[model samples]
Target chain A: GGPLGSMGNKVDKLAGVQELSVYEINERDRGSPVISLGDLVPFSNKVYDGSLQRRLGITAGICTLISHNAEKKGDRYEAQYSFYFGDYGHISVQGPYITYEDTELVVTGGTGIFAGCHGVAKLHQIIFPVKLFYTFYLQGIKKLPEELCASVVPPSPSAEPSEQAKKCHPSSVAPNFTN
Target chain B: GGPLGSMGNKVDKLAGVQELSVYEINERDRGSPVILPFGGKKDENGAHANSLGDLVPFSNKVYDGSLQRRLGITAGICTLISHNAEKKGDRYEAQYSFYFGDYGHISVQGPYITYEDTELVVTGGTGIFAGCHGVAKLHQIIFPVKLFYTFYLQGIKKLPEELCASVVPPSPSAEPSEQAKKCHPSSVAPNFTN
Candidate 1:
């Protein structure tokens, strides 16, 4: 309600939202950039300005990051995911923005625990702190084997409902356990 | 050895080389926009979209130095990008599909800098230009009216990915991650800290 991470108390939070719906989240960190290439040399006949931000200036090879939750400072994050991203995972995104235009990215073909993952995340910038509001339209996120989904990673006991417990499948006694 | 400043004598192993002057005349026909996004124009932040998530598609033409000869038709989806991570710029990189009548079809991809020359990679092509992989030296002239593309293509066989193999390297100086020892035919993540 306030500035992202500031939401209502317990039950009033992201309770019974539909599973596999739109997973809205914010990118807190912009990751690390390992490789940056600057092949545009001025010595060649085609002389360039040679200034810092000159022609075909600086080009980064790859910028990578694995972001967690995007929460405000005070009373920031409580539940697992207010917008119900469940897990941030490897966003499989590397590179720049569209300036003043919408930049659509393909999150499909993401290999993870179960392998193939398809997504179409549309990034909307809410520059309150120059952060990004990502609308990850995820699909084909293969469900883990029922046994493994629960056995290796057992759910929180139904009696004691913690905030992280809500990050379970609707089949479990998680909140919004029906839808 | 070939054309003006062609510098062809150095490496003659490349199968073929072609040159065509192209232009972005898709806008001269109309003043709509040379670059735009599906997420509409700019918003509150004076941006059309966000992050590395916008797909901008536009079309332009390849013309002769005189702007008289219709060289080719180039069109593609622009990967709208910002040079500076301060959340913006107007630069873009695109995988452009070019159809130059009798010459053939080649996909030239690289940054479409509003100004200055660009060194674009020629992904692939069809017909006579098939299996042709090289660079497109996009020499600029007046925005997009008269731009020259000097293509130096090497004819690699079929698809480069289908190389004959048992393509394993000699033992590494240091052992690779034992966890991914068998990942030669696998999908492996890095030392994923998080």
Candidate 2:
């Protein structure tokens, strides 16, 4: 479809905490090296749903090799993520260099159903990176409808959406706070 | 069909460019990768090899029509689908993104090429451009120097009419928001059908 029909590109009007489960593999070596600056590495990697149950989306961004000169699990790398969820659209996140022990990245912005979507992404390396655990603590952009948890998003199991589940217009909320 | 449904995607026209900054975070031992206005790092005329600069940093200007009137700025990289090993060829794919303060952060990426010009995608944005899916064309006023684009964005779900009042950009006559910038809003009175 000549790019026009390429990405055949979601939601409910809600606000609050919503979590997304992602399986990531750090393929920094496997991918063609763009370049290297100390510990900084930029590569493209795909994200899979938990247990590799579903194909979530794709990625293209950069990250720093925090443990380059240190020991195992010495520190967490600083990474800027550009996550695309097909129809749900894409979001950008950047985690800090807080020594890496306990750190969370801010959800900058997103598109379509995920527009103005702001939140946080926490990473927990499970059994190496081949099966990494990537979590999104997002307060859905109040404007777009709540995403279909049928896929990447696993809507809160609570019968009654908590106070955290109310939507707020994107104009009123800044992209700084969320999960 | 709810304008909000299926991204109610449509297309309109809007575009512009001008990159000028000095943030080559990982330029390597070589020079700057592409579009180097002020010559590469150490090299005078920027005559180097592949190591010229990888992960070249770019945060340039975005002009409104002419080179005088300022608009906004564009960032990140849009490496070619088939680019130069040291990089100088076009054929680059793009997902253009632009942010106008209170408006929102807008950018797009895709498998588009840059030859005499470029026809890139208008990413799926939320706030201002929600449900928007269209092509943003890149036309350089000059090669590698200063450039601008015209993005004709068409959204499936048009922003609400009541919310459309804030559609136009802040005129120079208005208050000085940030450097007294002047951006988009082809002046479409949106949500009219709201």
Candidate 3:
């Protein structure tokens, strides 16, 4: 509908990462015996719930790609955002809708994943790596959700559910459920 | 959208022109009309039509910036395709549109003409001229119906129902119509919209 050809430079310079991953969490039983730091246990894959990981990547303006790399065979897993990132899946640039398997993720937001889908759910490695081609421009940040304070890589603060915890609002931890 | 970062290259070498000119023909109602082939024609402002004349000064395609010059001025003129049998207009990796005031007419056949609200009534001309760019790469004679041709020029064997009484199409033709200006925003008729 417009002269996209003229904006070639702008389109080329748009910033975003090549891949992202997240942990999975479901909010089905909010009234149950809720653990202090939500239902997350201190485990290997538990720190990054799919929602939290995806939120971190998305908030950091990174593109998340998921590849189901199972040990034995290539498993076809469903995804909120895939666990692995490659030039995988079906994507359309013009309308930009993301279907299954063949997604052409362009320089827009996370593949327009939920634009025409159902509920989001998926657990992933939550790893955000750098590409050699784009690494030069990045200067030095190795990965994404790039911790705010590198030297003081502290644990998720155990909150008293007080004003200070809400003051530095951790939007990634908060959950919202709709009927 | 395929290769988000694919790069492009420039053509180190290119095609060249050999000869070219713009001719004015007086459309006679009866007898053989006089065809005046000139290197250039001076407008009231004295700008020559084919200013470069027929010459291969160098071995690169010439950019006939005619449309840019004659723009805004009200005038009608016919254009003829000739080559030094060589060429006219700008040439790049791909062909661009041809038009008034001075984008000089290109000699290639598949060139798409985008009108700036002007009716490109395609009168009469020959496809059989020597150095025809159409000969090797079969020319696509198709154009918008908005453009026209008379008799044999339209591929009709039966003599033209109308005559091209004037050899030179009107020079500095009328400026595009007001309807063209109004429809400029929504034009889908292969116009210079957007």
Candidate 4:
């Protein structure tokens, strides 16, 4: 289908998906960070740069949302989360396409929540934009497999299903409870 | 006979003291970080909130200086730690400031070394620096408080003067060492922000 599909009716047109692609994708494993709860008390220095393994960075996009959900016993609450993450910084020896990353968790919200609430829902929005200089090493380029390099200009894939569904048009059901 | 008289060129030229006109300093009694040394690992979810202390806000200018001497010892290696943290996002909350600080162990040529081979040299230059910013939070203000904000710091600083001498300038020092980074206790963010 064309970028917008039939009749310029592609979902990206209606839902504005093209505008969303502006993000710079960060691909790498960001270890979890040292997380702690601070109410009225001062937080620990360890909270800043947790050196230990348990204080590793958070995995990508885990709690990047303003999530509202139920507690284990099913109590409902609202919570906010922010992911402090870096791009996959390259390791000295790793060839092109390979990089490393570390992440941190920070933000405050209502209700009682644990550091690694795997089932917890959260939200992420950019509060600050960090400008970092990037270097793409030539050695990294040589490390790519020959097959991937041979036919370099690969074609794009079909749109994600979620993208396809949005163009269907908004429902007039906002005020109508009737299906 | 005011504050900062001891290290005198007659008080008016203190590196940081002279930069600011009037600022309020409040003391906080932060306990100790839960150490997870050797086979010691612990994480508490039932961790409570209201169980915290009050804080004072202050500011400082960043200055660079060379260490006359420096030493660091990792008492026992392989301490693993991990966690997730968060606080609510207020439309009004501006940027947060955090710092990474550690007690610098400056050991001078030693009279005695302490802790398993981690010697304590008598004369050295050990101070603290502010580094590392892990998250977003009142911790918007973090300063280099040597002993860690409360009694623990004063107590640690009060070890044998010899121990202090070991960590002082021209460090030939050695002893047990620990490290930490800090945020404001009041910069209290809820347990889950991100």
Candidate 5:
């Protein structure tokens, strides 16, 4: 079959597939779910860097149920997540809960190149320690947005944040939606 | 220009998009400032009728800096969805869910604001989408605590349906014995209970 498969008649062309690999560390722990609302503990100040074909750096803030797993043997916790990626974009994810093994997180929304981005992220806990090593396999449903093509190229290791990265923040300031 | 302009072309094409409208209200007495549990409370009475399939509904609150509304930053609620499948699986297990809201925030002047790019995920599916996977791009507009959304679903592919019906309109109070056995690794020991 060709790149465009013949469904016997018309071709069923492949939309697109983007593969991103991230290596990050969680250094800060903030929030306590036991006393607050259920799983409402927020962990701010988690950071990481990796390759999305571009130099990727991010800050992640999460509200979660991590405190409740005190009795679990292996390590199980779940949360609602928001990540701010320098220059490339930002996104929010809801988890079914994450353990030491592998768990899936949903990409609900985003901004910048990832604006209107929705996808699935397969999370693998690479190492469990005082400082954890985590790897992510992000497979998005749609092809890369037109605006983000510049990001696909491997960027200079020393490149600074772009103008777009400075202005795009995960916000609920207007309570409005756009085309 | 052609789809591939040069040997180094990095162009990516879009698959689909969709839009929707939802009017939700969070009774003040239940839980103020919303927070706790990633997904909001499950609504036994709320079910969405969709052309694609049936869904069990829940709501999640978008709080600003804290889960406490008294602290002065309380956002709205976003509706989340889970398919009416017998057992929920991992990403590869084909289980899917959705999230829609205006709780995203920034510090333009202060916290607790509304933002855009409310997308949803089709983690996995049942029935026709039993093994299918994809995502939903979302665009939302609001007016006085009201929302109008447009969702575009993409990257869908089907897998064979389950040999036995998974039960349409899944029973919430059905016997757990049968359901528990399906999730068991080896169904051993008579004393194990979920």
Candidate 6:
């Protein structure tokens, strides 16, 4: 819903990996004369399980790529991505381009089952050109069973879980199984 | 539920500044004690709280000269950052791989850090950043470990479909220029190379 609904108290934890096939959907070129600063490119993707057989989830997101050195040779590009995974999760990441085989995607936040999530998404690029394959190594914080009641409209005070209680007390609460 | 389930065709654009605070979490030092040709240290941990310039070449290691030859030492350091956000936050790994001349291949995952005076060269990328080359400028905000990063990547071009499939079979399609091949973690010297 909002930041308050997203907030939780817990040490960071591994969310799970999501394999996605993102296809560009822009009718025209997203970057013309090479991408300029503050260009909004839209995209959609299909999510797959480990075997790439079971359909785990779906994806849609926006890519805001800015050109830092546009007036120079081989202009560098920085990107801010707001990627969503069905109703269960969302990832907001920003960073410079040109990474090694391993680069992190800073996970800013999430919603739904992943509400108030925090962690990093390790990006593994698979293909290039028309189609791109990627895997998001996601991790974040999850709310406790009691905190889930807070998401409901106007919960009683007894249903409210303190931030400290939500974070440090994982043994008493079962993990939320969304996958 | 499925591929097209969450598909949307809308683009939202805005221009504003974002401020963030990152914490370093690695326990071990991430730099080398010696400097030599083609020989550098490797750091692949998460969270490095080393201050800038205090440690040259490598940020998280104590510098030493007598332990090894000073002819060709290349240092490679990798660390992760846990970002603090108003909402839940995420973590990112920064790979700083270099060796003075012929090596400024810095790959990162986060907000752009703008530099003050010099422009850092952008060579290439591995997975999605393959065939990528650009320049990066850094500007320090606080000290020790926080800064602003700005990148100017060359236009992303694709290799011919056939070549793309074969260049690095089984690996991600992105491939950098000479930089990728020359400055890989594997290319660096081992611990006790004679």
* lDDT winner: 2
lDDT of each: 0.36, 0.42, 0.20, 0.18, 0.32, 0.31
TM-score per candidate, chains pooled: 0.35, 0.46, 0.17, 0.17, 0.38, 0.27
Model 3 segments more than 4 A misplaced: A1-22, A27-74, A77-179, B1-186, B189-194
User: Which is the better candidate, 3 or 4, if ranked by DockQ?
Assistant: 4
Query: Among these predicted structures, which one has the highest TM-score?
Result: 2
lDDT of 6 by residue, A1-179 (tens): 64323221111222333222222111122221112656444333333332222233323333445545434433333544444333334445555443223356655444345433345655543332222234443343343323222222121212222343223233322232111
Residue-wise C-alpha lDDT for candidate 1, range A76-167, written one tens digit per residue: 11100011111122223222343244455544222222122334556443332233334445443444323222211111121122233233
Clashes of each: 15, 38, 47, 66, 24, 42
* Regions of model 6 farther than 4 Å from truth: A1-39, A65-75, A97-102, A130-179, B1-194
Model 2 C-alpha lDDT per residue in residues B120-182, reported as the tens digit of each score? 445555566555544454544334443445555443343333222232222222221242233
As a whole number from 0 to 100, the lDDT of residue B169 in candidate 3 is 31
lDDT of 2 by residue, A1-179 (tens): 53334323112322356676565544443343432334555445555444343444555555576544356435556766566554555566767633425457776555545543557887664433333456777663443333334344332222121122223233222232111
The positional error of residue B121 in candidate 1, measured at the CA in angstroms, is 0.6
Q: Report the poorest 10 consecutive residues by lDDT, candidate 4 chain B.
A: B147-156
* Two-chain DockQ for model 2: 0.03
CAPRI quality level assigned to candidate 5 from its DockQ score: incorrect
i-RMS of candidate 5: 12.7
CA shift at B49, candidate 6, in angstroms? Answer: 51
Q: Is the docking of candidate 6 incorrect, acceptable, medium or high quality?
A: incorrect
Question: Could you give the candidate ranking by lDDT, starting with the highest?
Answer: 2, 1, 5, 6, 3, 4
Error of 1 at B90 (Å): 3.4
- The C-alpha RMSD of each candidate to the native structure, in angstroms, is 24.5, 15.6, 27.1, 23.2, 17.3, 21.5
Model 6 interface DockQ:
0.02
Error of 5 at A32 (Å): 9.6
Docking class for candidate 2: incorrect
